[PDB]
Amino acid sequence: KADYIWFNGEMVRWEDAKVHVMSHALHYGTSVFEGIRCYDSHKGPVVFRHREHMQRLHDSAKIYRFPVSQSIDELMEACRDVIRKNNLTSAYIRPLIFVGDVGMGVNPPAGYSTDVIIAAFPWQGIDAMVSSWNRAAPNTIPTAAKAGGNYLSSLLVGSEARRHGYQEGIALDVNGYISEGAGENLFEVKDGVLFTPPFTSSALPGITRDAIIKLAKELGIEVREQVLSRESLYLADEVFMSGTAAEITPVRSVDGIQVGEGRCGPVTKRIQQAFFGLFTGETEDKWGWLDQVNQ
Amino acid sequence: KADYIWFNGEMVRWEDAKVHVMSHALHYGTSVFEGIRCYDSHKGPVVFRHREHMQRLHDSAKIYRFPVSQSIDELMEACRDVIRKNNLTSAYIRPLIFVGDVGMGVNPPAGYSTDVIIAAFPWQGIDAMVSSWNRAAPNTIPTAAKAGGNYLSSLLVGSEARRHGYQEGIALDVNGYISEGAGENLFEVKDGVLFTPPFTSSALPGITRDAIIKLAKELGIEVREQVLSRESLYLADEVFMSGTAAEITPVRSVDGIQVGEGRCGPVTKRIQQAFFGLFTGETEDKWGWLDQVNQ
Amino acid sequence: KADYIWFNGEMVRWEDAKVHVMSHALHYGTSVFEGIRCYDSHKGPVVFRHREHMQRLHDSAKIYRFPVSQSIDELMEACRDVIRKNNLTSAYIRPLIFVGDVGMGVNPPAGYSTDVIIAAFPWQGIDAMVSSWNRAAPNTIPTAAKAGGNYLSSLLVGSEARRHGYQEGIALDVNGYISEGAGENLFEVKDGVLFTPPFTSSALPGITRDAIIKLAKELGIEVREQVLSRESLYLADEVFMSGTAAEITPVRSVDGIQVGEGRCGPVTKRIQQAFFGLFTGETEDKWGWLDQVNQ
Amino acid sequence: KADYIWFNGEMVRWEDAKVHVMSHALHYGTSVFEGIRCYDSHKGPVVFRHREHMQRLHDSAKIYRFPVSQSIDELMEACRDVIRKNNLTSAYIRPLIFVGDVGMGVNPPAGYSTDVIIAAFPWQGIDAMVSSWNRAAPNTIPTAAKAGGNYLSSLLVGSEARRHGYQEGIALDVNGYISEGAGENLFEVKDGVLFTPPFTSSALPGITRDAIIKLAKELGIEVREQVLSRESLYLADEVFMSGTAAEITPVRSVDGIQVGEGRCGPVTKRIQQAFFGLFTGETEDKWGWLDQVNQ
Amino acid sequence: KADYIWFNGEMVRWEDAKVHVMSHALHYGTSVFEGIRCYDSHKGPVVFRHREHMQRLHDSAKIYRFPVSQSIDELMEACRDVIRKNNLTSAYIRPLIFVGDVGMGVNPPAGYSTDVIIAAFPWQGIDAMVSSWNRAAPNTIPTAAKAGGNYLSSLLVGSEARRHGYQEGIALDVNGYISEGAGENLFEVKDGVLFTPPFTSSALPGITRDAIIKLAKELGIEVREQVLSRESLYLADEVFMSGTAAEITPVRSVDGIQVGEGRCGPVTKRIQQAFFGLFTGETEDKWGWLDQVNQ
Amino acid sequence: KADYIWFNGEMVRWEDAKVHVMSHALHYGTSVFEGIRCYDSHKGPVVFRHREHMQRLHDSAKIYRFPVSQSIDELMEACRDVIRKNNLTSAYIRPLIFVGDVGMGVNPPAGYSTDVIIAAFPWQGIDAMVSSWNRAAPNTIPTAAKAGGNYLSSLLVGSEARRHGYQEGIALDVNGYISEGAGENLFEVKDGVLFTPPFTSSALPGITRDAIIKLAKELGIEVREQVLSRESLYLADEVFMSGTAAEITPVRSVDGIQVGEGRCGPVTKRIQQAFFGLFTGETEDKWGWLDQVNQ
Ligand SMILES: *Cc1c(COP(=O)(O)O)cnc(C)c1O
Ligand SMILES: *Cc1c(COP(=O)(O)O)cnc(C)c1O
Ligand SMILES: *Cc1c(COP(=O)(O)O)cnc(C)c1O
Ligand SMILES: *Cc1c(COP(=O)(O)O)cnc(C)c1O
Ligand SMILES: *Cc1c(COP(=O)(O)O)cnc(C)c1O
């Protein structure tokens, strides 16, 4: 927790960042959000993949049509201010754009607007389990949009797992194929080859997942994106999840069945290092993923 | 609007019913809610199917394991208190149980509690359109729960129709069979028979829908809950929707194709007469659907 | 073959009933048609279920929106004229409403019209087989509409069967459940109970199928409409198909597996008799299904 | 229009190319057909991908076992004869093989033959809409065949869009993934990459689509045939359709949501320049796509 | 154990009923079996719905075309002889029909034969879990047949449950609706109304399930065979399984959610009573369901 | 036949490898097996991709959790010993792993054990038919495992074919795309390009299929593992199956439609040659696929 939360343009003390109980988002799910990290690097404070997280913010809203007045540049400025103002060096940043107090109609009224908030606060395998709950089918609720009411599904998958002793629930899609974990993407390593499910497998265009396939590429790793069947979890040699909060989580077991040697992940280790190496200097920011706060 | 919103037990001045910005339900759509109508009748104010609505508030949370402190009777008294203290007669009541300012993780920290809030405020066919979006598939995000997050889907089906000049969009399930309108059930009359999709067609078990089947049975109309094909909409003699806020709306054209002779639903008529005769005294409340405020 | 074919209002000799090679129907499938019988009865010439066949004609067009100028009464008059003029007593009548010479655009041009034709000409089990071709999925091509391009599917199912020695191909739907034969409905008799698939099983609202469930009812037979699984063909006690051309066809084998005693059909026999009994006088036209030509 | 339609070998005065009204293709949609463009080029008249189109005429009939007397070269000569005898330069050619006046049963009487007829006549983005109808499912009515009956589906997807003010409706397959427009393929550009659904998404293997992939490869653009989710349409940088009659049409908005900056597709541009440069001589015909009439 | 297993028509000491290791069934899962109970009654030893279990043995083989020398009556007498011969009063009878030492080719040689055995040996709620595995889809492996290859599904659903602490795994079909538990049918109770999945939900046509439906009809309960959703499990008042070896087991928590008051089962109890009273003499065996070994 | 079947670590005269009739596997289909070939080579007796077949034996059991005492190497040596001991040069080796005389309960008691056997005995196109049965759906019965319960599917597809005159039945998945034939993988050839269904099409990860992909890559052919449609079968230039006992069989007509010229198979032939040349010495065994019995 901290002080100050950027909110509709201005910095507000943590405690006065309040909203009415009749805001649309609280009843209908109508908000859209992001997860961004800020690492202290060899040059950092640096936020990892800023522009790309804010452009996703804008895209989630585009799908739903929540009018948004800030620009990606305005929004990135803001996020840097929140960090700086709060005197944070390594934090989890959280932008949210939600339909505020507007009526109680599902279809908000014309020329209405969203209120936008940006808060920040300081920041072997694990045994996953396959869940009985499937992820969202296709043309039903946009899995590409990172919208707030999507997380009901992440709640179902996640709790079920925790409730039984695991640390993660991997969900299948309505087709019976692997989609992803409760709230983060799933990678398998077979014979030294990469492999993740495509988005049509109701997976979400993770930005970490993205950085990974790229590093995998610099690292000389073939990467195949394709539909994975349940069984593959039992036959893979490595399995690991990715996400802004998690980064790279080795999964050493799935349904109790050991995933090769009980976590060791030679490929995983290589990728991990490529990853952290970025904040250390060992890895070249070929692409331009670090955006210092203190510029 | 009104003044006074029952919030966790106390009545609060409406302008003061605020919630912090980091409340779980805003970000992750975790909240559950209901819609209840208060009608003025031949004796009313009379809350319609008050108990069924409150039980359903409880079923919906049971399904997501959200912890509710209040019993069903506490909730009912509080709804009646809310009506009175605002000096209301005919209103719309909105009870909302939601995960509050528990932390920022999807699985709320065990032993947390919800916040309940009850708010009340005063309160031919129509040309529907079949929508391009589909309702949630079966074992993904439970459609039998009136939950927050589900609403992204009523928004998608709902704006689309408005956007093209219709007054309601009817959604299909992932199998291509009729589900229900954006936020309300759908019925059709064929050779004087009733017909409405099963919950298995991704239809919410509606409290109004339930009332209509009962009345129908008393009016001696045969009723068939059965899966329906998109084309029946164009071949039916009558079609109409029902919901707590829309009672029974007849539909005169679907996709521009006139549902049998541009409205005058004889059966829709009789059912509209039975339903309203409840509040008039013409229809004998045999199930005990009306619950006065001042008792 | 005969002389005279009603065509757009007038009677034309069989040989001059011609149309341009660039009529829309020949290239795009855009026609809609019916099959009606005319039996010589104890009072007949009588056409069986006239109005209901012409109303279906009108409904197929309604789904597709092929403007039609004739009325059901105009069209029935016509059909009686064609019969009478041709001096037919027992015939197969064939109305067709197709998009004529209009352009080569799939979406015919505004205020265009259809040309309508009405021609007539004189009019154990069988071993069916289950086909590898599935029937049309749901919201793809209206199985309720009896449109001309639908018959590609009937061609696939039918030829496959004939090509292998059977007399009929029963098709499953995309779900793996029984839908119907190539061009006629499928009934199973289990323990003295009826059973046919509903339309949502991509079956077509056969008018014979309709008369059957009715007679079944007068006859004291319970009738259940529901989703049948493949296996049921092997476990049923009776199986039989229906259609305007076929009437009631006992199926004594399916995939070589005998369907109870190699056709005997006690229930089938009862229904059959109820059916023919109609033209004989033995059965009462409770419903009003005979429409004499010579009135 | 023109005068002279090649009909079963002879050239006939256009007004005389008539077919009896009881021809099979009118009632049962049994006919197969193609669309070929004749362009005037830096040497043209030049029939574009003439052989591929005629081979496809043959593939489509092979699939339904319609017997074709003419070889591929007979058909080509006849198409060139048709162009010449009508003194055409730039035209649209329509070859149609169809079941003629064989009897009235769905399975045409063995040893029957088709009738072929070849006719020729002279010849920002656009705002598409995602349709409420779905394209044919996999093993129902073969979508790899350009057949008559399939067209009921292009009509349904096509009028709907027109009916609501769009210039094209994009259809989804029964799985909720993008199939293709009403009668033409769909492509998207993302980070400068190409992407187009597989035939398995119920997409017809288009001859123009094929040309575009080839040119694209020569322009050095990466191409990915992969299943696509409805939402990619709103997130893509460019989107455009292709068909023999519509070449390459860019799409500027889908569902009212602007596809990246309301048209100017850089890549669509380059591909439009390569494709047209064929007829100009700027693009070297390496595959041999142009086939002169006068040779 | 016991001694004397019937075997191809002869009784054989238990230790001599051996079969070669290259018997079809051990490699390819080509056996078909039954589960039958002998009950000590108010007149028993009495075999429960003996013939119906033998008819189904026949049906299971008829579908896979396995040949059967023995009539139902011979199988029945042999069943009795095995009971008497072993001096049993209450046991679990197990008849198998399997493909023997025939070749290593999946299609047994023509005119082969199945070996037959008949072994018989002496014979609050539970807490089910919804399984992460699904049951056979429709036209894949006939589910109306108790083939032994099937039990790989039961093996996976049941061990998942056991491994996690539960005592029964309930499985969903491919559609996501409820099917049945690992080895038994599933009934739900709502407002004193019955409810169970039909076969098309990939439910074996249980013989107990049927007994129960028949009883309930006598008790005057209404029954609804209708498709069911996962969530209905957490909202019913009572849920219970049935099968030859579990008779009528009550479930009291599903996924750790109480089925309306940690068991109390009112309708469940009326049923069990009526069930067991058939053995006691209290329930009239109106149907003829009890066959005494000693006749 | 032969004499000496390995068995739980001992060699046993062929007639003494017997197993009790109440062994799990005969009732419940709980065995797991492999198909291996011993080839007389330019240096053989040589076992083809021996270890990979033994690893897969392990994998099949790992998925069903069947316990295994023997290492891969012990299974390998035992394989060799059975070859030598029987004085064989070319045979078909069959290793089984099955659940023995454990109880009649679907879940074997804890700490139980699987019995292991290893029998070995001496060891134009075809005309396939598309089957009316489909293959296991995705998360129902793991298809990446060669369990024996599975072969009920192979049993149904293959006998359908044989019964109708064909010699192989090709099966579709539940989606309607192509899966594989009764017992072997299916490859198609188009414009000198390879093509086969991925596993998610419910295709067993064949060991021949893999060999073939590897060869073709050496021959410089391009390969595409991609989902395939039924109709692609009638349009490819060459189609062929593969499996341990069929090596590489060419199909020349599918459903009675010639696969481009009643076999001539150019790419098919380059493959077979490269295949067989591994045994002759012509093809370099770059991978190490041949294990000599005598080491
Ligand atoms: C947020 C999210 C992820 C993680 O995405 P990153 O953008 O890589 O931080 C993965 N799956 C779901 C469901 C998510 O919403
Ligand atoms: C609330 C709701 C209905 C209608 O409910 P009633 O209880 O009849 O008020 C229908 N569909 C959806 C999605 C709903 O939320
Ligand atoms: C025409 C038709 C039938 C038969 O209908 P009747 O109207 O009973 O004559 C059945 N199935 C299909 C596919 C048909 O088009
Ligand atoms: C003909 C057609 C196309 C486009 O074909 P081209 O060969 O590129 O002309 C696309 N979709 C459908 C349904 C078509 O018929
Ligand atoms: C054996 C079986 C049952 C129970 O059937 P009963 O005749 O009633 O004992 C139920 N489900 C499955 C999968 C079974 O095979």
Ligand SMILES: *Cc1c(COP(=O)(O)O)cnc(C)c1O
């Ligand atoms: C055994 C099997 C194959 C063939 O596998 P190979 O290792 O290549 O012999 C293919 N399909 C099925 C269903 C099989 O089980």
